[PDB]
Amino acid sequence: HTPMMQQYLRLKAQHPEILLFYRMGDFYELFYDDAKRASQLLDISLTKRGAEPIPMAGIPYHAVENYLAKLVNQGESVAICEQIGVERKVVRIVTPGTISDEALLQERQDNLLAAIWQDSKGFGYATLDISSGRFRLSEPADRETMAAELQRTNPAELLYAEDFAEMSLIEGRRGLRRRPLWEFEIDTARQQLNLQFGTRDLVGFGVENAPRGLCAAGCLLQYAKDTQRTTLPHIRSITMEREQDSIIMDAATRRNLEITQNLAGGAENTLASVLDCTVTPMGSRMLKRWLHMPVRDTRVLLERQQTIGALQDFTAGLQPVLRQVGDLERILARLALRTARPRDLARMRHAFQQLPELRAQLETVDSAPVQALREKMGEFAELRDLLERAIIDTPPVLVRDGGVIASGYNEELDEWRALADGKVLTSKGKALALEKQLYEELFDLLLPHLEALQQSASALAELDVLVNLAERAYTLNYTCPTFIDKPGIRITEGRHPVVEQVLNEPFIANPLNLSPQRRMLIITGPNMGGKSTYMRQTALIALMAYIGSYVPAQKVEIGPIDRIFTRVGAADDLASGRSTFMVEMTETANILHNATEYSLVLMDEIGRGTSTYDGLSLAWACAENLANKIKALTLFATHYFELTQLPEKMEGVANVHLDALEHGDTIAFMHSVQDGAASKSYGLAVAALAGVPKEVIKRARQKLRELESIS
Amino acid sequence: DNLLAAIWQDSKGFGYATLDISSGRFRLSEPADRETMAAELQRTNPAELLYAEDFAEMSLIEGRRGLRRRPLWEFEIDTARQQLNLQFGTRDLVGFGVENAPRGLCAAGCLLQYAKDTQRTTLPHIRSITMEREQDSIIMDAATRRNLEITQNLAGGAENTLASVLDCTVTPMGSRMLKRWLHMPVRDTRVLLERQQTIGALQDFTAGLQPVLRQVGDLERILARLALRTARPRDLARMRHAFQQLPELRAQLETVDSAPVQALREKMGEFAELRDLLERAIIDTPPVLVRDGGVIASGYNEELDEWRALADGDKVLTSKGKALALEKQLYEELFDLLLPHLEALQQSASALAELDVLVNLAERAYTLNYTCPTFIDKPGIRITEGRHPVVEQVLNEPFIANPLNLSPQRRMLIITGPNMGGKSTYMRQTALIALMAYIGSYVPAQKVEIGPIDRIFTRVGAADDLASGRSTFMVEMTETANILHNATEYSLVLMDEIGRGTSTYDGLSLAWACAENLANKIKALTLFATHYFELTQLPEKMEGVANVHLDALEHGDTIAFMHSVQDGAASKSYGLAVAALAGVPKEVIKRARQKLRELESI
Ligand SMILES: Nc1ncnc2c1ncn2[C@@H]1O[C@H](COP(=O)(O)OP(=O)(O)O)[C@@H](O)[C@H]1O
Ligand SMILES: Nc1ncnc2c1ncn2[C@@H]1O[C@H](COP(=O)(O)OP(=O)(O)O)[C@@H](O)[C@H]1O
Ligand code: VO4
Ligand code: VO4
Ligand SMILES: [Mg+2]
Ligand SMILES: [Mg+2]
């Protein structure tokens, strides 16, 4: 009704489904439906004011960042409106996918805005990180491949077309946003993408012949430009990810091998925890990204191994210098969006001061990869000179506070400030205005070098990951792997990376040889004898070899690995309609349909969850199909000793057995892999060690004698 | 009594241990209150006691039978854990369920050494160490809560959980109370009977009460802020709105004639004097912060009204400053008047939350066809036309209700059935129905008679923590050991398969012995799901054990599952047919059937 209410309503019409922090006075406020939703999510009191009461809720302007964090975590998008001239407009829209602020973001985790589009011929997925600037395009052609991409990327906000047919993988995701179908058109996407990259055609990127992916990227770029309400100079490339480029891992294999998250859900006791001691946050995020998507390009891996070897001697000197550089990638993003704070520019100055030390240390070491990283990082002599002169040694958190500009950067600014300290209100007001204007000019001077600075941030992060891997290799005794043309895995004195560090008792290393001649190894062993660790050590060694890192073994020769499949454990989803056998069988079906000669298949106790005869029969058929028709390199762990006779019937299958010694009705585990087979599982002994009551174990032993006597 | 005891004190709390010479019963406790430790010392009434030389409070054990003192080195945790592990022949004590009690284990280590010294005859008769708890709440382990999906699903998501089905509470305080009730289900019949009477009584008027309850909002946070005197001006206005709402709720509840409903009405209160103070002292729409001013309303203070007049038609600016200072002092004075009644207000916020949870439960019951459960003295569960609360809501197809009867006469049922038959859903439906009955809610069944349940044990998952040092069979055997050691006649033990990790003969042997022990000695109410059809021959050999078979019909390649519980053994599980439905390639299914024919033929 009132003119003020009419203005809020016009802006609300422009942004209907998002909470609007309309700025009245010094307090941001929400009205009508937004006020009720905000009060429940932000825990702020709701007070109704008559114009027809209008529900109104409010937060102080000083505390806005703390409140924005609560809504961003809940996945709500909050548009912030400020009075520019009272004339007002939405200055920025804060959404879980595109947050570049330090408080809203997490230091060692990346927030990715992603787009899913389903055309009749397969799916197209595009992911953009606003802070790093990385734009990646993909064309998954199966529901299973699309689900793996969503789980691996873990998109903070996913933009799906209204007509998306398979709203099952999408449903339950965080920050789902329905977007109109018009936004996904290919011709509109091509024109917008070409303008941002400044290229007439996308042939140089190599994304020109992918139609579905380009449609998703056009929606993602348009939403990102609208959400930030400014041109995004940080985004300058659209690389395309292909299945051939990286080893494929399904969502289950990633969780079973504990690459970044343990089976319970914590980050403790994970391969990333053992390998990640990186000094800078950029390094931690980059190492996690490499472990999730290993590279199958030999040239990229060989350069990474050569850098690790060259810097291994000088790691102790480089790590303290790298720690000072800090998270340059995030700081450059704020500079690109022109939203940086004085402290961020001081951190940028500190990193530039460290660059001369890093360049000198890298110059002494002689290797083609290390010299290329040294050339890319650069010196930035001009920028460090400007930052040191323009900004004070310890600047305030916010520009409005004042004191951001050091004396002597501008004679006029110093004179106005001196007059006020020595009309005083006029001089203070003029000084605050001039200091703000000079700060904007500093962004303009730093921005033309953004292309070089972004290249330097990637080089420094790469050096941090490679130096960390080199330091880890020296401390944990890892050695470099070598690559072979035909599919095979040969490991000497291999040890599981995580178990070796966590277990106080000495790890007993084991050898593995898998070749086209010996495609499958059936591991039969005493319970608690180490079979699962032996199988998982092979996958973790193979993943570590293909991320360019040194492997935890005396020597490893690894041939091409297209995909790694792990069937481990059993789980029930009663609400989804999936029984424990159904969940296991769909995973087994995925291995049988999608496996290739290059792929490595690790299967643990397949055929359990059903009667013994049905389980053994399905296990024999699945083993015969994998060894005879798929011809994949596979490791099968089984307590069904009937399957031990497969090698005699079929060539290309061998039996390996872990062994344990039984003493005085107690079990001692050698944990050593010896060729042959084991006919005893020692189940009652493991149960007694677990704490099953002695009376129960004695009756069980009596029953076992009776059952064995019957046959 | 023949009881040797030990006591310990530290910054974390107090630890205690008990050993009975006659029965070889070794138990530990960690009572964290001095008064609780004093009550425990009297309840145990130990023949002999051992305490730390530097125990801080000797008054708890100042006068005791044969009181003795032993050195600190005997009480050290690392030495104690190794000795206890060696005495029981176990790698870890996680299976006994006492691994996570540091103080309790430390006292137990001193008692074990002393017991060996006093008699070596009792030492071979000590085989277990269990915690002692007669807590009113039904005991549920962390694994049981996640397996039953009481509040959090196995993936970690909020959806597809029992709390999601029942959590439609209007106010945020109500949602917290329901989640707290689900985690601790009260076992005392009197409190539950009062809650059930309220749910039935307020069933007719749920639509009238819920809109008024929604207006009250969350008062727990506002009252906590008032206690720290950090309450915002708007938060005090929110309290005033709830005071205005309370007369309406009381009038609606006055027509109802149930003793529990009337008690809840009295606890809510009217707070007319507090409402009068807030209405007179605070403006209708107060500012977010008290610093700006305008929070106090004219007429609360005569001096402020006069200063406000002078402020608004440089000396005038000084008068404006005086007005802001007078207003802030009045605001602090307002907290002082409200705080004496803060204990009374806290009782009222709890009463309003209980009304919201019970009105919500009543609405859920009418919408979802739930019925009241009748408590019985002896330990038994009887369910007629029972349904699973979560599965029925998320399943588009109809749910097939299955009957359950468990008594001391028929304590154990071996459920055997086809894969995807519904055996696990049937076992869980019993657990969620028992928990729903014990929180005072209406159970999802036509009729339920639930007897006392001490603890609910669920052994379903099979996972390995390699870094921890336990394989999948050790993790499963650790859970089975906790079931056998900590089970009681009252406990409800649901076991989804055992021996799924070891070879068929070792697994069947452990399953036969664990099943015999639970029926013959523990005498717990057990539901056992199994694919070993050898165990279906256990019911004739052992009393209290019966067979329940789920039904399926096979036509050609596909299978249809009845989801109906009938008495019998099944004897066939259609694993290959379920694999074909899962999508295993036809050639793999064809080879599997050929091998199956050869295995059975020989
Ligand atoms: N070679 C080894 N040296 C030392 N410890 C080992 C070795 N192999 C396995 N272990 C230990 O065995 C446990 C895991 O055994 P696992 O392979 O899961 O057994 P299973 O699958 O037979 O039950 C962990 O304690 C792990 O540290
Ligand atoms: N009585 C029933 N009526 C209808 N559907 C049922 C019934 N019991 C189970 N289901 C469905 O079957 C699924 C599998 O049941 P479940 O007990 O897990 O079988 P099992 O564990 O024997 O494989 C459930 O998640 C549900 O979708
Ligand atoms: O994975 V095992 O503990 O059953 O040998
Ligand atoms: O899906 V089952 O738990 O009947 O093997
Ligand atoms: Mg294993
Ligand atoms: Mg089951």
Swiss-Prot record, chain A:
What keywords were assigned to this record? ATP-binding, DNA damage, DNA repair, DNA-binding, Nucleotide-binding
Q: Name one GO molecular function term.
A: ATP binding
Q: Name one GO cellular component term.
A: mismatch repair complex
Instruction: Work out whether the entry's keyword set contains Nucleotide-binding.
Output: yes
Binding-site residues, ATP: 525-532
SUPFAM superfamilies associated with the record: DNA repair protein MutS, domain I, DNA repair protein MutS, domain II, DNA repair protein MutS, domain III, P-loop containing nucleoside triphosphate hydrolases
Q: Which PANTHER family match?
A: DNA MISMATCH REPAIR PROTEIN MSH1, MITOCHONDRIAL (PTHR11361:SF34), DNA MISMATCH REPAIR PROTEIN MUTS FAMILY MEMBER (PTHR11361)
Per the entry, what this protein does is:
This protein is involved in the repair of mismatches in DNA. It is possible that it carries out the mismatch recognition step. This protein has a weak ATPase activity.
- Tell me what this protein is called: DNA mismatch repair protein MutS
Q: Which organism is it from?
A: Escherichia coli (strain K12)
Swiss-Prot record, chain B:
Record key words, sorted: ATP-binding, DNA damage, DNA repair, DNA-binding, Nucleotide-binding
Its job: This protein is involved in the repair of mismatches in DNA. It is possible that it carries out the mismatch recognition step. This protein has a weak ATPase activity.
Sequence positions that bind ATP? 417-424
Q: Name one GO molecular function term.
A: identical protein binding
- Name the GO terms of the biological process aspect: DNA damage response; mismatch repair; regulation of DNA recombination
Question: Shown portion of the whole protein?
Answer: 130 to 799 of 853
- Top-rank taxon: Bacteria
- What gene name is listed for this protein? mutS
Residues that span the membrane, as ranges:
none
Q: What is this protein called?
A: DNA mismatch repair protein MutS
Q: Which organism is it from?
A: Escherichia coli (strain K12)
Q: Name the GO cellular-component terms.
A: cytosol; mismatch repair complex; MutS complex
Q: Which family does it belong to?
A: Belongs to the DNA mismatch repair MutS family.
